[model samples]
Target: EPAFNYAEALQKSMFFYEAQRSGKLPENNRVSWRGDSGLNDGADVGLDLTGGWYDAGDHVKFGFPMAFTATMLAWGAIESPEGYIRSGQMPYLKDNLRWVNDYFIKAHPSPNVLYVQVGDGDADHKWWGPAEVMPMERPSFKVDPSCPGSDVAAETAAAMAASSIVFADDDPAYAATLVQHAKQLYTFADTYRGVYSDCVPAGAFYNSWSGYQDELVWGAYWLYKATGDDSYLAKAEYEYDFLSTEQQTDLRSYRWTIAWDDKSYGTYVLLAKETGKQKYIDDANRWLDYWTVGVNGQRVPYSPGGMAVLDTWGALRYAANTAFVALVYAKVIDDPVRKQRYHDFAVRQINYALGDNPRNSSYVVGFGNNPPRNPHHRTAHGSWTDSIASPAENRHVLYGALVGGPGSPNDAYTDDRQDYVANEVATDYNAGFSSALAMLVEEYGGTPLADFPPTEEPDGPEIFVEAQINTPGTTFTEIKAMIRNQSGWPARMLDKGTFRYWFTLDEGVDPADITVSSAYNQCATPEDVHHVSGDLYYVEIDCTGEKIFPGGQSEHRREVQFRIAGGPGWDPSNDWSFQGIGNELAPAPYIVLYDDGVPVWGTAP
Candidate 1:
């Protein structure tokens, strides 16, 4: 049995995908901090490529990795439906899977064209803030017949086909729609036959290092599984030899792991299961053997703690992905010894990720013991400075995010947000691990936490006033104030922004006797004094014309200076707003902020 609850892990894994969602969120969105974003993603190109998971810590919507993530997630749901249902995560799993599939449908708006990338990598990487307030130009990129991208097209075909099967019982009409898109995409991929990165600028990011050959077979296999079409199965079998792995006369590179870049290992497993051919089974066995014990004296290197370190970057992802493959293969073969071996290998790898490692650490965020807290994710950090260093800690927990693991062959890791290689969480990273947890839950029978995804409390005031006494006098007080918009739970614009500085009137002084004046500023002006109570008065500072929105601090803040003067009897020391006056601006709780005439921040006397 696993040390931690696999059901809880499975549930949280689905939430990680929810956190990575882009565009408008559903009303029942579990990730409380996320909001509508990338609303105009493909608007520049006269298309709507909105709504998909951000590829990684950054905001670029790299279609290749996203499709892989979707395919793996759907594969898990299809393979272990009972696990998801028993764990009480079937709804969340379906919702998360549908998010990307819906986006894929939009990406394939035309038969010959597919929008593969959105948001320029160079521009999006330059800043860090909540996704709702992403302040960079998000340019769209696509591929068509003139500039083909068979890799992404085929991968998307696989994702749609796998998802169609998952949604068959739940929504038959939607399932048919997905199947239709899958067929069209697979045909487009077969006809196009070119590297996706060559046409889309995502080459610098999720480049098709392994090319599109495996994806053709991967897509065809999924199509065969979904529609049970013999033609699709034949097509998949014919395309199997085109894989980069089969090109080798010797050393067929069977040790490689499944990843966004390569689908050969996954294809091998699928073909072996579908055809039951000797060669397909041998290929599957060889790949699983390399991941498990060893295959012909060639085994992947392991860390001191037992994780199969396939590659330095995303080490845990590779291990978890192979663990899924091994678990799936274990169920397929009737050999009892190999089944146990492969099953045990899968369990050990999953356990290692959960917390059974040299560091005694969990790589999945917000799960197990001392799970990752500082995943290199921009939206979760909710930085107002457009810098990763500002927030110091993630503002929202990216629950279930499987962060990139140890960058070295050893089991060393640091929970640093700057170490993108080791700490960044991605869409693909959680896909396999989430599936593995689903399978484990079916075997171990654990329970998901009740009343999951509690509403998150704000870290601080979203809209507030910070003030300091610019000058102190017996009869007059000049104050410098700033109204900052740090609204990140769906960062939005405040159209009717207003704040008030409260003060007690001197004895014998009336509201008519006092004069309030504001220094010249572009966005703010002092409103007429209003009587709050007997002898208590406040000066309203209207910022209605200023469009305060969430960006960096410099971009979202408005400054104003005001002076309040009265009769010579005016005493400044006992004034409510002036009680905590200082030289530097700080939060003044006595100063209330209002939006459209409703008090939102500060206390009123």
Candidate 2:
């Protein structure tokens, strides 16, 4: 048996994609914490671009990376269909590919127009909360013949065409539909040759630095594979000459990585496997050798523990994409020795991500030994404070998400939720990894968990109170309390709310002799002392009609500073709520909360 269950890893990676779903989720959606979001995505543009996966940790829908993610995922299934079926993940892969492919269909309402981005990056990054409750206005952006975006359009075409192959046998009508849209998009991309960022508002993040030529070649090649159209092949081969000098020659392309920005490396492997020409084979081998042993004594830098260190940001993603490429080329190559070398490199890189590294920490969340618990994701964190700093830990596990790996060659890594560079998880991060897992499953058989991705249960209270002793004296007790509404198990409003502070009456003290007064009140009105039991008394603070819910922290809590004075025999030590309270606010069990006159949180005296 393998050291880890590659089948389970593949299962969890699919679950991670389900978690990143944007717009409305389906009835069979497995993610419990997620709900219908971005329902009105394209209303601003009078179009319907309402579905797709969120690009990464934040809410912006950059179509460039998203299309690439889909292409990689579909390519993996196309290459390793036996592995997918063996792992019982073939059905899941199809549905996952459809979710994105369907979105591409909706995004391309016309042959010449396509919606490439939604929600402003700067505005979305400023607010941190669940995808269900985005605080800012969301606007959609697109590109047409007047303002061309060849890169994004071509990548989307490749994604649809590649995914069409996955569904050709199972669902032929859907496959043909995808092929039709893919041809239209390829034509649009070929006709208008310009970068997407010039028109779409995604330059700050997913810039098309590698330009559009690689995607033009990539789109045509996938179309050729889908339809067996020699014309498409000729166009792809013709455009091959226009690719950047680095991509044309294996020498410079080997030094680069296959990512959303650059499709040249992936193109190299695809052309090699499809044409089997000496030129294409040499290009693919040079790219693989650079990542594995060496290419002309120059190779991708490796960490001390043998993990290939490509870029400081998303190091694991780069390695995993290369591993997918290596695994693909390994299957087609004739030489057994070099084939094993590529296979070993792929296994080593995937293993390093799955807890075979120096720290012995799994870079993928919710798998293997000591996996990352906190990924830099907005919805998974479920922050009520609108701040990533709070909630101390992630509210939900983004299962099977591959975090951006170690920042340095020494494998220096942290699981901090604030470190987006080293800790963020994205849709693209898991695409190649998920595909590679399928290939591994074929080699060394494994079993998927019978009841995988167990429904996440709520871990803590949705509503609670925090308090501290504001001032203390022999004759008076002044306390400060904040009633909070951190409700997120389907966050609902609390209308008729109350907070009670309990204390035992002294021997000589009477209810008539005590006075209850509030110095400050944000939303509550303090009432006189009331009897609880034989010797217990409590002051009720009325919070009726004060709507509190979990949109953000500023509006979810109310602070009230009230004092019980007008007595010399006041005993603060005997108070049930004041026993453990310090200068700072902490969860007080004695401070009971009532919603609609029903006791909800804390124990009643």
Candidate 3:
């Protein structure tokens, strides 16, 4: 592959690391094994070990770690090829990977099975553990009474199975262990008949039951791809069939702006691509499109209008879904319109998220009539007690703006600007905006006009430059020019409307003596060529034209060109060496000019 633009990617990875290090990750973790009864049930088996965090329920947990691993691997493997080992950064890829390996995989005390907690008390424990543990007997254990049987187990198992493939690639020695895990995951899928539910008993999983089965289907596809196991594909087919039947009820598709929805679509898109199934592709497309519209249109209540929302934990879900779907559109569909739409929308969302606010308005409010303020939706602190009420209450707000703002439109009753700014910072929009911009700038170029060239040039002794208007990559349209006489003498100049070049020569030279033209084909006539001050003349070219001195000495020629705002142009204030014609009729005398009382030029007319 070509040498990638690693700078932007590395910067993005650094931003992700910093946000994660600052305790932003847990807010969007979104995975929970315990029923959504809102209690600190010891039964909460997954990684939301922190009590206050919201449970995205089982679906998020099962796939989130894997998705996170994929992102980390992409950064570590492709983006930061030198690896995080040398950066000495905290929460490096190696460290985070180790956390997954130790905390979720190797050291997790739960049996190698899937279980969803139900009921209110400790006595109501139903367990659906995986039939086998790594390097253990096939079908090693029966589904626990409290567990929801093989269906739910299969989803988690499949994720673990897919993760193993990635892990084994990372460390070949782990291949055998990964195979064992895959076998167990498949065993659960085979036993469950493809429909994974929260718990075997009713009222256990609550609203979390539906999506788990979809994850299992996705996991099966990934497992099949990794292991070349025909059986996994068959199981995946069955799960997909089930989802197609169950989820198609409301033909009108919707996407959850939250993390799990994004992950679910990601998994589905992966499956669709592998299977080449239009149904899967359509489903994935629906979800991806939904979220894109949701974020861009600010359809979701939590996402502010006109910007993409970044749920710290949910971002991986969004990234995975958006990236994978975009790849499919770019590669498989070959639909440029669709591809560009996704690319543009995705880039905008990400750029907006990373704090590269194009509007130039600071989301953070200071003490001015409308001070800059951070607009993050949910503070890491969570709840009113932990909320940021003042500068003293939350000092991090002072460091810099946190990107992301309120998801929904501000209520009619409030000051909208204040609300908008507050919402942007509260949501940690900066991180996502920064990441997206990095990606876009890398894929496209850093500046919007990084690829564009100037359209006009300064024409003549007098500097005349115009800003490029309608060019694709240009970000701004304003044009400014300053003419400094580099010549030994000051040339009085006139300011004309829009486009024109004006220069005044010695007292005797006619204004018509200085001709103007443009290099571009369009030759719009010079509009207002008139004297402004002593010896200074201003000329305007309504269209494109260049500067030409028709009868001046051929050897003593000067060039003219127009420069855009940030482009290269001659600065008029700088001193320039000037040459003029000597009087041919003078009697043994040269035309002399005087500035500071010393006779510099003596001419006979």
Candidate 4:
């Protein structure tokens, strides 16, 4: 009876990024599920390692998987632009990608050099606090034109190329830089021939088993899409032929594996789109069709609960990944009826992950009643205060993260958090799951549509307001306040005209010392500053709806810095705090306060 909460899943999907954040906590960060970790480990390696999502459940940022994840997110962003914008997540998505790209740009300082990874995978898993907090001095790895990392370089190149298209229509200049990076990185990937994972011993986790040729073709295809140049297309075909020759396996067959390391199917999907040739399209369908219905020699077995057991480990994640291609294939295919069929099949796989399985449980955390609890994730396992004492559950829930899943559909899936094989959550696990969720919302996050009942919308996204001082910073930096919408339903997308927030400065904060910053984003001058009781002042903060398009889930940051009333009791380290008031249109807000920069107390509403 429990339906898939598409909005919640999407919102929770974004939460994975928060749990994976590195570097300095920006003002836009809505201190929600994962409180601010201490800023660290960006320049320790001489290059800025800051700003990229930590790979999987660990603090180490793997270049290959990060690029893969970005490529998928960009694909999802483009395929279901309405899903994000309609769900009030476009701004955060942009900001999240921007954060990653910034690091990627830094990682790829020049055409020759590209930093593959920071921190030791083995060492990072040992002791953790933040990336910088680890006691040991982690080693940094890089690859250049000479000592090339074709696998990751090309993948990153493809990721950057694919992402350029996503941001192109939104911000042309930003897209321009990303495309340029993509072009050069593609060259580095194609010209220079070596696996970075093999070059860097620590990168064994993301080692290229299927070879780097797939990456060459993948990057080439994405670059072609971004630039529309036939040369890239030619390269993609040439490299693909190289792959088929070396591997000696037909890509059209149902024998397929989808993950952080695989891009063969993805390349074909693009090829199917680029070419009107029936042969390639048929070849693309050959693999997917075999998996869907099975061929003479091959069969894609399903769990009694109806989940496709794609692999012995991480079956659910793989099914979701395959579902992504199915959906994309459906989108590109010209048949309306077949489109709906493939779309529905993709929905079935994701729904199976959501809660439709034999256990009647959701593999994704923070959604259904029987959602995952004991995820084999560090963030979920780090805390003991939550429901963690129970082996069945972790201390903190990783919202929106899809677990590795049960061994199979009929196979028993334990809720035990320690079970990494059955319960672990990873970046790759979520990459495809989130994209599939985008498709689910795009197709069905609305009123009743043929056979499927109305996917009810949640009461509106609640606003999470985080007001805290940066650690070690005595002043709140002419503080900028942004209220990010924490809603998740992929329902009615609309422009949030304006929301009202009246700042009530607590006692001990000086009225005279209120220094406002001229720099602003969604934040501007407070509409009216009223003299309330004592040092408490009522100031209406203006949202102005500037960054509020699909951008409510971030912090509602306003700029107004002031020293705590100097002489007597100034150790408070803030101009007190303000309540982010909400109107009839908006749900009540959750407020988190801070001491220094660490989260000291929150109403936890």
> Against the true structure, whose TM-score is highest?
1
Q: Tell me which of candidates 1 and 2 scores higher on TM-score.
A: 1
Alpha-carbon deviation at 501 in model 1, angstroms: 2.8
| C-alpha TM-score for every candidate | 0.94, 0.84, 0.45, 0.71
Q: Summing lDDT over every window of 10 consecutive residues in candidate 3, give the lowest-scoring window.
A: 129-138
How well does model 4 score by local distance difference test?
A: 0.64
User: What range of 10 consecutive residues in model 2 has the weakest lDDT sum?
Assistant: 244-253
Candidate 1 lDDT, tens digit per residue, 1-605?
55779998898888888888898888877777888889999999888888998989998999999999999999999889999999999998888888899999998888888888899999899877778877688999888888888889998989999999999999999999999998998888899779988877877788888888888888889999999999989998898876664345653448688889888888777877776787788888888887777866878898778888887788889989989988998898888988998899999999999999998888888888888888898888877767788778888888888888886778889999998888989989988998899899999889989988877888888878888988776678888888888877757767688887788888766667688776645465554688877777888888886777766766678888888888788887767777776998899888888989999888877
Identify the runs in model 3 with alpha carbons over 4 angstroms from their true place.
1-91, 107-111, 114-145, 149-155, 189-209, 244-258, 261-264, 285-305, 308-324, 356-404, 409-605
Candidate 3 has a TM-score of 0.45
In model 1, the runs with Cα more than 4 Å from the true position are: 246-251, 502-522, 527-538, 545-550, 567-576, 579-584
lDDT of 3 by residue, 321-418 (tens): 35434533444545576567676666544433333343434332221123233333222111112123322222122222332233333311121322
Q: After superposition, how far is residue 251 of candidate 3 from its true place, in Å?
A: 4.6
| Each prediction's RMSD to truth | 2.4, 4.6, 26.1, 13.7
The model with the greater TM-score, 2 or 4, is: 2
Ranking by lDDT: 2, 1, 4, 3
Error of 2 at 35 (Å): 2.3
